[PDB]
C-alpha cells in the first residue's frame, strides 16, 4: 500500500517490457526483408534456399467451368477436424457440419493413425446424415505447407503447429487420405481438391466481395496467400492470368532474418516447441505461442520480485498454462481488474491490484508486438501486389480468419492501423470469413471436378 514503491515496481516492469517495442523503421525493415524473401521464393533460381516458400496452389483467376450439387469439405490443421456438407448451385451454402476433437496420439503418432482417425470421422458424419452410399466430390482444407503438382496432388513439406505424425512428410497428402478411406472401405469419395486454409478463407470471402485477392489466418498459426501474376510464378509454366500463392510466411526468420528482434522469451518458446528453429515469424504472432510468451514474461517479472511477491504457483510454472484466450480475456478487462483477478486466482495465484495491472501490460506488450510484426508481413504482400499490377492506387480486400484476429479485443485495431501506415496508396478493406473453410473448399472442388 506504499504508492511510491508500487510506482517504482511498475517503472521497473516498463523498462523490461520496453524490449517488445518495434519502431515504424523496424517494421519497414521487417517488411523489406519479407518482400526480399517473397521475391526469392517465387524464382526458379532461389526457391530451394528461400525461407518463404511462395507455394503455387493451382487456384487461378477465371477458372471457367464449374459443376453443381453436393460437396464434402474437410478441414485439418486449425482447431479440431471438421467435416461439412456444402450445396453448390447457380451459390454455395453449408447445409450440415460436424467437428471432431483429434486425440493427441493421432497428431503425434503415425500418419496411418491420423488418417485412419480422419476416415472414421468421415464415416460418422455420413451416418449422422444418411449419405455414406453417396459418392460426393471431396475438397480438403489442409493447413500445412504443401508442394503441389496440381489442385489434387501435393507433398507435405513439413508439419507445423505441433503436428508430428511420422510417415507424412514427403508424401502425397491426397494419397494418404485416399489410402485411409480405402483401408476402412465403408464409403467412397472422389478427392478432387486440396487447399491451404488461407486459400479457403480468401475464396469464401471472394464469394461475398470480388475484390478479395488476399487470405490471411491469425489463429493457432499465421500465414497468408494472395493472387500473384502467372508471369511471376516461375514454378508454374505459363504467364497468362493469376494464380494463388501460399506464402508460408510463418517460416520467415528461419534463415536468420529476424535475429535482431528475437528476445529471450522467443528463444525459450522456440527451444521447447515441437519444431525448434522453424516457423520463427509465426512464433511471434500465432495463438499456439502467444499465451506461452506472456507466461515466460510473467516468470521473468516474478524472478525480479516485481510480481506475486516473487513466488510462482505450480500452474504458472506449467507449460501452456497461460492460454492465449487468457491474453484476450485480460485485455478485455473494463478497468475493475475482475477478469484479470479471476484468471490469476484460477492459476493458483493471490494477486494484488498492482499484480493485475502488470499482467495486463505484459499481455499488451506481447499482443501489440504480434499485431505489429503481422502488419509488416501483410503490408509487404499488399505493396508487392500494387507494384506487380502497376497500380497508382490499389483498392483490395483481405479475407481473414483465426481466433487471434477475431476474438482478441484490440489486435485487429492495432494491426489495421499499422498495415495502413505501411501501405501508401492502398485502400485495404478487411473482411472476416463466415464458415470460411467449407464454402471455399467446395467452390474449388466444384471447378476441379469439371
Ligand atoms: C482447379 C481450380 C482452379 C482455379 C480455381 N479458381 C476459383 O475457384 C476462383 C478463385 C478466386 C479467383 C480470384 C480469387 C480467388 N473462384 C472462386 C470462387 C468464385 C465464386 F465465388 F464466384 F464462386 C469464382 C472464382 O473464379 N478453382 C479451382
Ligand atoms: O493455419 C495457419 C497456418 O499455420 C501454419 O503456418 C501452416 O504452416 C500454414 O499452412 C497455415 O496456413
Ligand atoms: Na509462370
Curated annotation (Swiss-Prot):
Q: What is the effect of changing residue 152 to N?
A: In MODY2; decreased glucokinase activity; decreased affinity for glucose
Record Gene3D superfamilies: 3.30.420.40, 3.40.367.20
Q: Where is this region: Hexokinase small subdomain?
A: 64-195
State the InterPro entries in the record: ATPase_NBD (IPR043129), Hexokinase (IPR001312), Hexokinase_BS (IPR019807), Hexokinase_C (IPR022673), Hexokinase_N (IPR022672)
Q: What is the effect of changing residue 37 to K?
A: In PNDM1; decreased stability; decreased glucokinase activity; decreased affinity for glucose
What the record says about activity regulation is: Subject to allosteric regulation. Low glucose and high fructose-6-phosphate triggers association with the inhibitor GCKR followed by sequestration in the nucleus.
What changing residue 169 to K does, per the record, is:
Small change in glucokinase activity
Is Phosphoprotein one of the keywords? no
Coiled coil spans = none
Subcellular localization(s) per the UniProt record: Cytoplasm; Nucleus; Mitochondrion
**Which stretches make up the Hexokinase domain?**
9-446
EC code: 2.7.1.1
So what does this thing catalyse? a D-hexose + ATP = a D-hexose 6-phosphate + ADP + H(+); D-fructose + ATP = D-fructose 6-phosphate + ADP + H(+); D-glucose + ATP = D-glucose 6-phosphate + ADP + H(+); D-mannose + ATP = D-mannose 6-phosphate + ADP + H(+)
> For the region Hexokinase large subdomain, what residue ranges are annotated?
196-435
Per the UniProt entry, the effect of residue 203 to F is: Increased glucokinase activity based on measure of catalytic efficiency. Increased affinity for glucose
Query: In UniProt terms, what is the effect of altering residue 271 to Q?
Result: In MODY2; benign
Instruction: Provide the effect of residue 156 to P.
Output: In MODY2 and PNDM1
Q: Which family does it belong to?
A: Belongs to the hexokinase family.
Instruction: Read off the PANTHER family from this record.
Output: HEXOKINASE (PTHR19443), HEXOKINASE-4 (PTHR19443:SF3)
Q: Which disease is it linked to?
A: Maturity-onset diabetes of the young 2: A form of diabetes that is characterized by an autosomal dominant mode of inheritance, onset in childhood or early adulthood (usually before 25 years of age), a primary defect in insulin secretion and frequent insulin-independence at the beginning of the disease. Hyperinsulinemic hypoglycemia, familial, 3: A form of hyperinsulinemic hypoglycemia, a clinically and genetically heterogeneous disorder characterized by inappropriate insulin secretion from the pancreatic beta-cells in the presence of low blood glucose levels. HHF3 clinical features include loss of consciousness due to hypoglycemia, hypoglycemic coma, mental retardation due to repeated episodes of hypoglycemia, and seizures. HHF3 inheritance is autosomal dominant.
Q: What is this protein called?
A: Hexokinase-4
Amino acid at each position: 500500500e506504499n504508492l511510491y514503491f508500487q510506482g517504482m515496481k511498475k517503472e521497473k516492469v516498463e523498462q523490461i517490457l520496453a524490449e517488445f517495442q518495434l519502431q515504424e523503421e523496424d517494421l519497414k525493415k521487417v517488411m523489406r526483408r519479407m518482400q526480399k524473401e517473397m521475391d526469392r521464393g517465387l524464382r526458379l533460381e532461389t526457391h530451394e534456399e528461400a525461407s518463404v516458400k511462395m507455394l503455387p496452389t493451382y487456384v487461378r483467376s477465371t477458372p471457367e467451368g464449374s459443376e453443381v450439387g453436393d460437396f464434402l469439405s474437410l478441414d485439418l490443421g486449425g482447431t479440431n477436424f471438421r467435416v461439412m456438407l456444402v450445396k453448390v448451385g447457380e451459390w454455395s451454402v453449408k447445409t450440415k457440419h460436424q467437428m471432431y476433437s483429434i486425440p493427441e496420439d493421432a497428431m503425434t503418432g503415425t500418419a496411418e493413425m491420423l488418417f485412419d482417425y480422419i476416415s472414421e470421422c468421415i464415416s460418422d458424419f455420413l451416418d449422422k446424415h444418411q449419405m455414406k452410399h453417396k459418392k460426393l466430390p471431396l475438397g480438403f482444407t489442409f493447413s500445412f505447407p504443401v508442394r503441389h503438382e496440381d489442385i489434387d496432388k501435393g507433398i507435405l513439406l513439413n508439419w507445423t503447429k505441433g503436428f508430428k505424425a511420422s510417415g507424412a512428410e514427403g508424401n502425397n497428402v491426397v494419397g494418404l487420405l485416399r489410402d485411409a478411406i480405402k483401408r476402412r472401405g465403408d464409403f467412397e469419395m472422389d478427392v478432387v481438391a486440396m487447399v491451404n486454409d488461407t486459400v479457403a478463407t480468401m475464396i469464401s470471402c471472394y464469394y461475398e466481395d470480388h475484390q478479395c485477392e488476399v487470405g490471411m489466418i491469425v489463429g493457432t498459426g499465421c500465414n497468408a496467400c494472395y493472387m500473384e501474376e502467372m508471369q511471376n510464378v516461375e514454378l508454374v509454366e505459363g504467364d497468362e492470368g493469376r494464380m494463388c500463392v501460399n506464402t508460408e510466411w510463418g517460416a520467415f526468420g528461419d534463415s536468420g532474418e529476424l535475429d535482431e528482434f528475437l528476445l529471450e522469451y522467443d528463444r525459450l518458446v522456440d527451444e521447447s516447441s515441437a519444431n525448434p528453429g522453424q516457423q520463427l515469424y509465426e512464433k511471434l504472432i500465432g495463438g499456439k505461442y502467444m499465451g506461452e510468451l506472456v507466461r515466460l514474461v510473467l516468470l521473468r517479472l516474478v524472478d525480479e520480485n516485481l510480481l506475486f511477491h516473487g513466488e510462482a504457483s505450480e500452474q504458472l510454472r506449467t507449460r501452456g498454462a497461460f492460454e492465449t484466450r487468457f491474453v484476450s480475456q485480460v485485455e478485455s478487462d473494463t478497468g475493475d481488474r475482475k477478469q484479470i483477478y479471476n484468471i490469476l486466482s484460477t492459476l493458483g495465484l493471490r494477486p494484488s491490484t498492482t499484480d493485475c495491472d502488470i499482467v495486463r501490460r505484459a499481455c499488451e506488450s506481447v499482443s501489440t508486438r504480434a499485431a505489429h510484426m503481422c502488419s509488416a508481413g501483410l503490408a509487404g504482400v499488399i505493396n508487392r501486389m500494387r507494384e506487380s499490377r502497376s497500380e497508382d492506387v490499389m483498392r483490395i480486400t483481405v479475407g481473414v480468419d483465426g481466433s487471434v484476429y477475431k476474438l482478441h479485443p484490440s489486435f485487429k485495431e492495432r494491426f489495421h492501423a499499422s498495415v495502413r501506415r505501411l501501405t501508401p496508396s492502398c485502400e485495404i478493406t478487411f473482411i472476416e470469413s463466415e464458415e470460411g473453410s467449407g464454402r471455399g473448399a467446395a467452390l474449388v472442388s466444384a471447378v476441379a471436378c469439371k
